[PDB]
Amino acid sequence: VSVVGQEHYDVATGVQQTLQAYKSLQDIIAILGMDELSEQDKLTVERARKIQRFLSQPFAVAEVFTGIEGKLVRLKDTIASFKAVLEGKYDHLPENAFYMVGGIEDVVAKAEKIAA
Amino acid sequence: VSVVGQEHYDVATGVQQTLQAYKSLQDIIAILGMDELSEQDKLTVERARKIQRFLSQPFAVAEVFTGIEGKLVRLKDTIASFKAVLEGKYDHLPENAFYMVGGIEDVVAKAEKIAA
Amino acid sequence: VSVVGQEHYDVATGVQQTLQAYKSLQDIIAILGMDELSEQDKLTVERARKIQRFLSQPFAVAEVFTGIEGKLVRLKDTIASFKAVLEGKYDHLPENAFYMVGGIEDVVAKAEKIAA
Amino acid sequence: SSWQKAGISFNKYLAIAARTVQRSLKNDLKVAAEKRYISDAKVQKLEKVSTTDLASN
Amino acid sequence: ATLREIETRLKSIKNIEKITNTMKVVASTRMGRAQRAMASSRAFREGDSDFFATAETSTPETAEKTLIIAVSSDKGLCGSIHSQIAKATRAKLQETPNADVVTIGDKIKAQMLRTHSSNVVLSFNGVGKEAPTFWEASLIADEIRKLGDYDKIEVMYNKFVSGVAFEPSVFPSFSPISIEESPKLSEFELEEDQAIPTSLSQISLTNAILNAMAEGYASEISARRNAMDNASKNAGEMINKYSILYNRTRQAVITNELVDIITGASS
Amino acid sequence: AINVGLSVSRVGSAAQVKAMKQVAGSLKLFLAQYREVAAFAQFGSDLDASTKQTLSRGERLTQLLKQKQYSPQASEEQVPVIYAGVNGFLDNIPIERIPEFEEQFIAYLKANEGDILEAIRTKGELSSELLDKLKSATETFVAT
Amino acid sequence: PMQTGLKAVDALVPIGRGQRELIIGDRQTGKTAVALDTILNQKRWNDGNDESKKLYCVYVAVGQKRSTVAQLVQTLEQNDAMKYSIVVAATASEAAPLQYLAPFTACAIAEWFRDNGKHALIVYDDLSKQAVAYRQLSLLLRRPPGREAYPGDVFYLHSRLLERAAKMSDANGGGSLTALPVIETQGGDVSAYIPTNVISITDGQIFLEAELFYKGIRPAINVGLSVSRVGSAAQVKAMKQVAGSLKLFLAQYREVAAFAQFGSDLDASTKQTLSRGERLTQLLKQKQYSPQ
Amino acid sequence: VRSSAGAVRDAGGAFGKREQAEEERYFRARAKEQLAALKKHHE
Amino acid sequence: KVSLVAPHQAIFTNKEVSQVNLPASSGEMGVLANHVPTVEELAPGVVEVIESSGTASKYFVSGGFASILPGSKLSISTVEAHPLDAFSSENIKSLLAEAQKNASSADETVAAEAAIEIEVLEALQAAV
Ligand SMILES: Nc1ncnc2c1ncn2[C@@H]1O[C@H](COP(=O)(O)OP(=O)(O)OP(=O)(O)O)[C@@H](O)[C@H]1O
Ligand SMILES: [Mg+2]
């Protein structure tokens, strides 16, 4: 928090805590299923899947293997997009709208084109 | 049965059979729950938890880590207390009255003081 | 098909497909019965029981354990008997007429002598 | 018949008449019949998520 | 990922596969006995309740909100049993959120408290263990906290449309003021001096609750058999993948231990 | 990340001060009870009215003990923070305000009731007079 | 037929004269208990006059301590069983050459009775202690090692001493020799280095688990893991009639034993197999030093 | 393949932690009903 | 054409009957080929259904509501419907003797429930 600030330190701790809870409970998700969870464990599993695909951006050198354009997100745009998805502002969007995209601007444009 | 007697041989075999049967029934409760247990399986789960905590007594050299005083039980008091709990004479008592106690005299005094 | 011919490759593929479908459907027949199926599933299940016992012929050295004579079926007689049972020429025969037999001539003599 | 003299409705009157006729018939023919007249269900009225005294029977 | 960690994971996965396979075989035997109770309840809904179809009994305007009754179970491990019942009751409560909810199970009351905790007015536990009978449906209808003072009374449950899947259906229940105001209600020789309007309305609530509990129990038992078979099949694929990793780790442990004794003896 | 169920000390309570051992005498037992009750919230159980006080006090005690880098505390500031979290005085506060409550409680005890902070560092213990003064100052400081 | 005295050994895996029955198991699970009960049960035939029915025991204690060898010899003398039983004392406090040659020295003394017209029974206790003594002398003699810190002749050292205990024909004298090697496993793993070599060379192995010994099975003998290669050819005709029907009922009750926790959902065929399978397993449980 | 006597609690993973939390939650609820009934019977 | 469907099994189910006489609350009325719509309450009597000739099956109904439709349909919905040969004469005397002694002996609904059980047991024992 002394090099990246107080805003960037809270977003990094919140994103890592959601991914660690879904990975430890994978033995009940792959055996019993996703219906064996409670009300609090169900919302954390859906947000962890969308946060893992949003961090994977398509590079400019891998345009021939993926087919999409290269996305270069800045440091200020990446911290604002991760904090809004963890607060409940992007819970109605699908999980495929954030895969292979940029920041918060590319996630809203991909969800509107897939629903048309 | 020829060194400790016929009375001490039945108490050692009965305590080992109840502790070994609780390990097989604990695996079904983690996937199905407590609804699969009948009347005999429900009483065996409560008797196995109180018998494991009754054998753990506070040592005299470990008084700085536990806090309580050291208790020393004799050979005749330990065989009489284990045979009465396996028959159904201490089924109404809780599991906290036998934890960190001595023989049959310390288990009855801890149950009346915790309820007041 | 390039070592045994086109005729032997078609008979081996048809017998392996009927035996694989009947083995995987054994878990559903024990929980849903034998009459809760379609028209195509009922005809394939009746032919798979007789085809599994037709390939088990009695050897010449094992006549003192089963009581039946030793049958030595050739390569041309085994391919002609398996192709006629899969086409519907032996659908009216019993399931016990093909057990402990070898060849197409042994199935016709055992079925006519079982009833009369 | 006697539904106006008692405080029970038509739902409770049908269960009391069927249970009495089953116990007054053949005693040996009571196989798989005593479970329909005995239940261990409970009822508890909630308010606001607290509830009052839970009843039995 | 050593030898002791692979043995504990393989032994624990084998015990879960045996418990899942035994639960699926026990669910197949209980589904046969439950089929007779579900088939008997369907005959009562078409014979005893046939007077409402010939008289055209329907509701009209709302009178002091309404009343909802969610029939479910108290145990889990049944797949999407509690998720399908809570999603059907939440969609119909959008146009009338002032109505009360009467949960008849621990699974339906837990999901409804996270969205509409103020709408829950009745909670009944202990009904999903054994089979439903006429004594359990008659006791919940008489103690529903004024059930006859509502215009519309719905019974949310799960209807087993097939022997593998199910769907969440709903059945309405008329009150005493709506049974006597039907179109062809005067065609039957009914006594107006005795209790005929209030008796036919109270008997329909216990009859519909017995049919919804019998259909919901058969649908929950059928859904539990599919979840137990999927858990047993998923455990077999995980045990096969763990066996390949344990076989490679056992061969690598023997080669690493033999290389350490050969290096020290040659120096 | 210090695991209470794995890390232990062979010296026991003899290598600690008498002031921290009196206000936090049940700190080792509260960590084992709060770990078993935290896993029950992810199963669907919402009952247990008697276990609501222990489940709420275990979450506030773990966040208050987590300090930042290069921010060590003395024996006088750690004895007042452990007494308000073990006696139930921090159960009525929020979980997000656990960081701001530690700085506000240490600043008010250095300018108003400075005699209680100097007695816990010089003597290193708390008798009957020190226990009554610390409990009354912690209850009145919770209401702003 | 080799009368062992146990009800679960004489009906399931029945051992005969001339075969090699392994006694696998973990620590304190019924390893030496099966070998001691079989040697003490031969008092009904050795005290008579029939020389073909008697069987001289040959307990070869290798790897045990000094207190374990004195306690086993005192129990056999009180029941009149030490007069016709050879005792090969080989403690672990001696050299490595004395413990490794204990299996070869005990087999040569017991072979004199089989070559004359009598029967013998060797009990190599244990097979795991004999393999550690042979690898200690080979590592100090400047030799290359192999798997699990053993020499190249690891499989040939145990197969050569176990193949000599066979049943001769009528032209050689008519004698036989039994080999009862106890394989001390680690933690129930029967597919180890020294465990797999002794099970593949012997004609049968008796497994002993530590979970069945604490439940009530005395001794813990798994019917689904222990089997005999001789079958019913080396048994009595009176006991073979009752062992045929009990083998099918014990195998079907083991696979359907998971339905015992739900007794309220049993059918007609499920209730008959559970009641008959529980009474057959409890009747074969015998006490210590109480052979039938 | 065999020897699965208590392998769920001996692992210490997801199934091991859920078994200990389920047994501790059921024993804590039953102890409150047993302590309240014993105090009322003594007076 | 009858529809005697109970809450356990189906008796008539399909329309394949002629005449049926069931004891109602007013009197012992019997339905013919196409009875009029007279849906009345059924009392605890005997519900016999004549099958063409003399193949009638006496079914002792526990009471219900004999509903008749206008399209030649008779729906006799009852709680319990058992035959006359499924009851014993020795076991029926124990329930009738216990209900008479318990009547007018206590309060609440104990005395009111004993009067209804004594009247239903006396009518079934007289039709043997
Ligand atoms: N069937 C049985 N019933 C009762 N007790 C038994 C039985 N089998 C063995 N025991 C007990 O087990 C103890 C050890 O038996 P045994 O000598 O066969 O094994 P062990 O050689 O001690 O095993 P280890 O070498 O691993 O220590 C004996 O003291 C005996 O009392
Ligand atoms: Mg031994």
CSV table of C-alpha atoms in Angstrom, one decimal, chain A residues 29-89:
chain,number,residue,atom,x,y,z
A,29,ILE,CA,-18.0,-28.8,-6.9
A,30,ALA,CA,-16.5,-31.6,-9.1
A,31,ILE,CA,-18.0,-34.5,-7.0
A,32,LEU,CA,-21.4,-33.4,-5.5
A,33,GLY,CA,-21.9,-30.4,-7.8
A,34,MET,CA,-22.6,-26.6,-7.6
A,35,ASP,CA,-26.0,-27.2,-6.0
A,36,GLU,CA,-24.5,-28.4,-2.7
A,37,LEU,CA,-23.3,-24.9,-1.8
A,38,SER,CA,-25.1,-22.4,0.4
A,39,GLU,CA,-26.3,-18.9,-0.3
A,40,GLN,CA,-22.9,-17.2,0.5
A,41,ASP,CA,-20.8,-19.8,-1.3
A,42,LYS,CA,-23.0,-19.6,-4.5
A,43,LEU,CA,-22.3,-15.9,-5.2
A,44,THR,CA,-18.6,-16.2,-4.6
A,45,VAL,CA,-18.2,-19.0,-7.1
A,46,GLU,CA,-19.8,-17.0,-10.0
A,47,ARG,CA,-17.7,-13.9,-9.3
A,48,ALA,CA,-14.5,-15.9,-9.2
A,49,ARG,CA,-15.1,-17.3,-12.7
A,50,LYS,CA,-15.6,-13.9,-14.3
A,51,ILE,CA,-12.6,-12.4,-12.5
A,52,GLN,CA,-10.3,-15.1,-13.8
A,53,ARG,CA,-11.3,-14.6,-17.4
A,54,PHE,CA,-11.2,-10.8,-17.3
A,55,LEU,CA,-7.5,-10.7,-16.4
A,56,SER,CA,-6.6,-12.7,-19.5
A,57,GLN,CA,-6.1,-10.0,-22.2
A,58,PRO,CA,-5.2,-10.8,-25.8
A,59,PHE,CA,-1.6,-9.7,-26.5
A,60,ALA,CA,-0.5,-8.0,-29.8
A,61,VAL,CA,2.0,-10.7,-30.7
A,62,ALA,CA,-0.7,-13.5,-30.4
A,63,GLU,CA,-3.1,-12.0,-32.9
A,64,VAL,CA,-2.5,-14.8,-35.4
A,65,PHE,CA,-3.3,-17.6,-32.9
A,66,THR,CA,-6.4,-16.0,-31.2
A,67,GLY,CA,-7.9,-13.8,-34.0
A,68,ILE,CA,-8.7,-10.9,-31.8
A,69,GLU,CA,-6.9,-7.5,-31.6
A,70,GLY,CA,-4.3,-6.6,-29.0
A,71,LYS,CA,-5.6,-4.9,-25.8
A,72,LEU,CA,-3.3,-2.8,-23.6
A,73,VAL,CA,-5.0,-1.8,-20.4
A,74,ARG,CA,-3.5,0.9,-18.3
A,75,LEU,CA,-2.8,0.7,-14.5
A,76,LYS,CA,-5.7,3.1,-13.6
A,77,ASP,CA,-8.2,1.4,-15.8
A,78,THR,CA,-7.4,-2.1,-14.5
A,79,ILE,CA,-8.0,-1.1,-10.8
A,80,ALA,CA,-11.3,0.5,-11.5
A,81,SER,CA,-12.7,-2.4,-13.5
A,82,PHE,CA,-11.8,-5.0,-10.9
A,83,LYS,CA,-13.4,-3.0,-8.0
A,84,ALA,CA,-16.7,-2.5,-9.8
A,85,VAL,CA,-17.2,-6.2,-10.6
A,86,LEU,CA,-16.5,-7.3,-7.0
A,87,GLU,CA,-19.1,-4.8,-5.6
A,88,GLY,CA,-22.0,-6.2,-7.6
A,89,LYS,CA,-22.3,-3.8,-10.5
